Amino acid sequence: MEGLAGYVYKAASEGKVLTLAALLLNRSESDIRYLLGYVSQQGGQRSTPLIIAARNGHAKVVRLLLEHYRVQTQQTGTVRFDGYVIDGATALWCAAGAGHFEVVKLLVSHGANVNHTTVTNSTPLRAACFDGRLDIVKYLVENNANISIANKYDNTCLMIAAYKGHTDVVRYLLEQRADPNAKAHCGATALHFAAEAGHIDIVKELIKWRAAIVVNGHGMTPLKVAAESCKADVVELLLSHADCDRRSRIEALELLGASFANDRENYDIIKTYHYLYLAMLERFQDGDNILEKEVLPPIHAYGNRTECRNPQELESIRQDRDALHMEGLIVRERILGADNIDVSHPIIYRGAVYADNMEFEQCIKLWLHALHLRQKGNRNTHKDLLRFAQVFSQMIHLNETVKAPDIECVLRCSVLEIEQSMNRVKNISDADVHNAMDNYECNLYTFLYLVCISTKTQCSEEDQCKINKQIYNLIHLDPRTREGFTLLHLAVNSNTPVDDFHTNDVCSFPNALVTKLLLDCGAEVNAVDNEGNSALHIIVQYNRPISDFLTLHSIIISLVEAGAHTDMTNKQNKTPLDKSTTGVSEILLKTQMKMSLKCLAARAVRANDINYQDQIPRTLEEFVGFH
Amino acid sequence: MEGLAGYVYKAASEGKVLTLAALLLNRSESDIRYLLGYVSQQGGQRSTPLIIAARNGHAKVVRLLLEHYRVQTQQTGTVRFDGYVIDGATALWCAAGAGHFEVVKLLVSHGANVNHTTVTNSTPLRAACFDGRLDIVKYLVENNANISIANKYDNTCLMIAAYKGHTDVVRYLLEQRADPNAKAHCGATALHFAAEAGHIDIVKELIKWRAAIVVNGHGMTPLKVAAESCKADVVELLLSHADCDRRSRIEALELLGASFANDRENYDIIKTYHYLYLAMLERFQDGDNILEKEVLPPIHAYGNRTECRNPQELESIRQDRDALHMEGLIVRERILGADNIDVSHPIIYRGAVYADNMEFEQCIKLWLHALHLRQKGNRNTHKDLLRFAQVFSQMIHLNETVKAPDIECVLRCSVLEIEQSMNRVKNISDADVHNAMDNYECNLYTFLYLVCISTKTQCSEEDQCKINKQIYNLIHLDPRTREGFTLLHLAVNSNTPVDDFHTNDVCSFPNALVTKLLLDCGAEVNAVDNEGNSALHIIVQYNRPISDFLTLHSIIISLVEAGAHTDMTNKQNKTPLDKSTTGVSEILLKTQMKMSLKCLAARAVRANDINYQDQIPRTLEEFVGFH
Amino acid sequence: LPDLKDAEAVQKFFLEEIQLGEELLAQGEYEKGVDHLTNAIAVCGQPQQLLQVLQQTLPPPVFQMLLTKLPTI
Amino acid sequence: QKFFLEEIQLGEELLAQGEYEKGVDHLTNAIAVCGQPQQLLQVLQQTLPPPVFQMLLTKLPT
């Protein structure tokens, strides 16, 4: 009875309690259990009638389901607050997530479970803290709620509450003798999450109740994270607690000025100069025994400006905007370190400004330094790689040369990150295998864009040879797409996507020179995809033939002169000539076809079935399977 | 034992009289009567327990106390009434204020004075008329009283009966030969106040006893007062008197149409056009010897339109609702005069209406004219000045430029209003000395907000000099707050209140721009409050130094450059270098603290206990007095 | 009025009348809702459990006016 | 002390609660504590109606 069950579920979900009771006239208890087990993939997700009765917020519906009738609260559910489709989501968890005080009160009062565990092992208390209702948390905790249970990331409910601005929830939950020293395996000490969105009152509350400042696993103090997040007031409060430790507050002010220098959210450059002036004055306040900033090498991306040793230098660079940006980045590198994630994000933004003022020479170096840091940290760099493809495309479009070392280095890092992406694809079983595959697709597209850029420049000799070496290494990797294509297939294709930015100016696949470098670099020319097509079979499925006549000539003559059997005869029993779909393509293939005796013989014996299992050589069996 | 009297009242407020009997059981009769003479300062009243128990109306307390020990009921107390406090009050007056026939009828039977005057000289018959209980008024006239009892403003009991709608009180009062034309201090008459409320049965009751219309302190008729507010039904009833000529009925009914155009209670545009048309129809039905309204210039604030010259003009603008609001105000201003109290209030209401519709240009024009008309009348304009600060803050928060000539006009009003408030403070002895001080404080806060608005908004060369000229005039007057802060002290102290409306979003204190603008305008930086704190003293102590350090640095740089002495100690001999909340303020002051041998000499004078008295010139005495 | 249909209106018209009654009492025009409730009660033919169940899914003034509007003895 | 006061306060309170006879008996113990019968009896007549007081008047000497 799928229709009756759908009616019952619709009545429960839409709050139609009267029609639900109408559906409850003398029904069989077996069908009632069938209604209870009607998970029935509504909305593409796991849910029972009681789960949606807690979801929508109709107390009368919940009353009719289990105050008077029988239904269990423990079912496989789905929350999807932030994509969190979590199995085992009970009625209490969803109800506390939705903030229904009456429904939660009834559910606890009749005697349902109040400490339910899900796949992410998150109690309804943590969902209530995520929503931030004082009454729900009050009623749960006084009705025997355990606060010690945390997420699969060991994310304590106090940490989740402090991540938002629920100061009442935070203060009550610490009034329930919860310790703020609950260190997650991520590294959070329940106050970093407070110092994320500038929740100043929550930070004050933790400071009052023995905050016990603890460095995370990233090596950053809460004060350092507060400075990095560009929130000044929490920097004040963290600076005014427990251990002052003058070095710590000095580097905190340095970090705060540096973060204000090159962040998109706060760009008060005068405030950057003033905070750095405070840091310098504190460095030079006591007179004797003044601690001095250590010497760092002048990294060429930030220029040869070796920090700011003396306040005279800071006064000199007071009105120097780009020098201030470089000083901010250098202070970020020195204080925040060159290992964590938070050092990467500002750098690109500064280069982004240089990307908009057409001052490409600093932008390329700065962005390349950001990429090198990302690759050293083994982070996800596909977005930055696509950014470099875009900026090279814009550089070539605006009649500007692209330096060979820059494209060589970005090709090296692209190859290395493609290696890492392949490792993630073949190593991550099911948690993020699809995300890794999409990363692989995007990286392949970006690498081909960069190869197009490399071809379309006034390249040197030996650095272009290094480019060819790197591309040959990536071809020797033999990357494959989700559609089983090779890089040759994408290079000769027109269905390969092109990024919506300035890449459309030069990324005009199929491009002649990209294919030229691809096959002259050495590649598997007969890499038939899992769909059965070849590179020639890709190019005969091309609907814009005349507009690229010279490039199409080049790719056909190149494929014919290097492998690319012109009689591939794919698994769909279609010779590449018969898929030409254009008189030009079939004419060129026929003129480029060659007299092959035991290939017309192969065509003769293909449709006319002749046994080949060990009667012909097994290499000829591979030739037949190729046919 | 005044605490016993308070507990007697507390047991009297709940009506428990045997508890009061037990307390009086073991006590001297003369001693307990002294004890129940008056309660202590409880609830803003040190009144007699018998008075306040009768005010609460618990009659059983009154019976048991009076029958047992016949204490004098004239033992007055500091009784609160109608929010305010009116001492000199007797028990039956407070009983008649709340309304309790059985309390008074026994208290008069016990023995009292039927005409005991309060501090406002309010006899018990006045309170009986205020409540409106006819039985109480029947009992006071049973024992006889006076009807010409003078109030603080010489008010008649008919006037209070005209405030409410106790027609039985009105008819019984005039049945006892009471003149309804008993003029009050402000020309008020029972016809005027009946027209203020709108009881048509009362007005016809007055003329049934031959009441005659008369002018008021503003010189207007009761018909005009009915037209001053929006109570239409009273107008036709007084037009039914037929004593007044047709010229009076034109302006009266036009003002009725004018009043209905712009008022909070009534916004009936439909009847507004009717009344103007009926006024026009009677104006133009004369034919020969036709009369017409006079000419008035189109004040730019009142749009740019005249009132009416042709019937077709207002027949055409009947659909133009916004024009009719303007047409309503123009005829109201023209006839009521510029000196009326209520000629200004609808203009503020119409400006308030345009504020909700984000038509700030028309809102400023109307409010400024309402501000100017109120200023000519020498009224207390601290409220509408705050409204200008409120509406200017909303413009800045919504990213809209403020016409700086309007800033000049409101500042010129704000400057001149301070001069009027200063004279009022030195003139008022005890009548509203606290209210004038509160007006003085709120106006000084209002002036600062407008200055902050001027800094935030764009100002041209002519605008900036005009704004600075007004600040120049005020700072030469040297306003002095209740605690003794100057204008510079007020703009630095973060404890300076900001209005709870949108002024919190724009003008926040301390403000660097306000502090800089004040100093170079010509403010005195060496100002010292009554407590002794200098301008430098207030800024150095500061709660959130890291949070808005740009404001703190700019103020300190601006203040010291003005010429404040960095050693100018307060009455507690605490330096500006001292009283530092955070070491940031110590560093910022010290890095600008230029050292002089004179101030170190001055420091050595007080530190060494040198006898500076009667041994050094007076000019250097004050220099030592700084330290 | 179906007037004792065999099986179709016993289940379909009863559901329609009861749901019209529900939205009528939800919108505040609950007298027509109570009329629909009575019609659906008569149509279904087994109003025993509903006699309690529909008793506990409405405010008490609705119960009072319903028992006045229920002369089904 | 206050126990004599409480029977007086709760005795008249119970009259407001409807227990007039019980309120009389509750307050009766307070009257036996008091040593001034001539002054106290006349005071009780004004608080509550004398027909009710006459019933309370019988409880003291009995």
From Swiss-Prot, chains A, B:
GO terms in the biological process aspect are:
apoptotic process; branching involved in prostate gland morphogenesis; epithelial cell maturation involved in prostate gland development; proteasome-mediated ubiquitin-dependent protein catabolic process; protein ubiquitination; regulation of DNA damage checkpoint; regulation of extrinsic apoptotic signaling pathway via death domain receptors; regulation of ubiquitin-protein transferase activity
Species annotation: Homo sapiens (Human)
Q: Where is this site: Cleavage?
A: 342-343
Q: In which pathway does it act?
A: Protein modification; protein ubiquitination
Query: Which protein family is it in?
Result: Belongs to the fem-1 family.
What is the protein name stated in its UniProt record?
Answer: Protein fem-1 homolog B
The stretches annotated as TPR repeats are 344-377
Q: Which residues bind Zn(2+)?
A: 186
Q: Which GO terms describe its molecular function?
A: death receptor binding; metal ion binding; ubiquitin-like ligase-substrate adaptor activity
Give the SUPFAM superfamilies listed for this entry.
Ankyrin repeat
The answer to whether UniProt assigns keyword Cytoplasm to this entry is: yes
- Quaternary structure annotation from Swiss-Prot or TrEMBL: Component of a CRL2 E3 ubiquitin-protein ligase complex, also named ECS (Elongin BC-CUL2/5-SOCS-box protein) complex, composed of CUL2, Elongin BC (ELOB and ELOC), RBX1 and substrate-specific adapter FEM1B. Homooligomer. Interacts with PPM1F and PHTF1. Interacts with the death domain of FAS/TNFRSF6 and TNFRSF1A. Interacts with CHEK1. Interacts with NKX3-1.
Any Gene Ontology CC annotation: cytoplasm
InterPro entries, sorted? Ankyrin_rpt (IPR002110), Ankyrin_rpt-contain_sf (IPR036770)
Curated annotation (Swiss-Prot), chain C:
Where is it located? Answer: Mitochondrion outer membrane
Instruction: State one molecular function term (GO).
Output: unfolded protein binding
Topological domain (Cytoplasmic) residues are 1-73
Q: Which key words tag this protein in UniProt?
A: Isopeptide bond, Membrane, Mitochondrion, Mitochondrion outer membrane, Phosphoprotein, Protein transport, Transmembrane, Transmembrane helix, Transport, Ubl conjugation
Task: Provide a GO biological process annotation.
Answer: protein insertion into mitochondrial outer membrane
**What about PTM?**
Ubiquitinated by PRKN during mitophagy, leading to its degradation and enhancement of mitophagy. Deubiquitinated by USP30.
Cross-link type Glycyl lysine isopeptide (Lys-Gly) (interchain with G-Cter in ubiquitin), residue numbers: 5, 12
Q: Does the keyword Ubl conjugation apply?
A: yes
Which top-level group of life is the source organism from?
Answer: Eukaryota
Where it mainly occurs, coarsely classed, is mitochondrion
> What membrane topology is given?
Single-pass membrane protein
Q: One GO cellular component from the entry?
A: migrasome
The entry describes its oligomerization and partners as: Forms part of the preprotein translocase complex of the outer mitochondrial membrane (TOM complex) which consists of at least 7 different proteins (TOMM5, TOMM6, TOMM7, TOMM20, TOMM22, TOMM40 and TOMM70). Interacts with TOM22. Interacts with APEX1. Interacts with TBC1D21. Upon mitochondrial depolarization, interacts with PINK1; the interaction is required for PINK1-TOM-TIM23 supercomplex formation which is critical for PINK1 stabilization at the outer mitochondrial membrane, kinase activation and downstream mitophagy.
Q: What does this protein do?
A: Central component of the receptor complex responsible for the recognition and translocation of cytosolically synthesized mitochondrial preproteins. Together with TOM22 functions as the transit peptide receptor at the surface of the mitochondrion outer membrane and facilitates the movement of preproteins into the TOM40 translocation pore. Required for the translocation across the mitochondrial outer membrane of cytochrome P450 monooxygenases.
Which family would the database say this protein is a member of?
Belongs to the Tom20 family.
The protein's name in its UniProt record: Mitochondrial import receptor subunit TOM20 homolog
User: What is the scientific name of the source organism?
Assistant: Homo sapiens
Q: Which residues of the full protein are shown?
A: 57 to 129 of 145
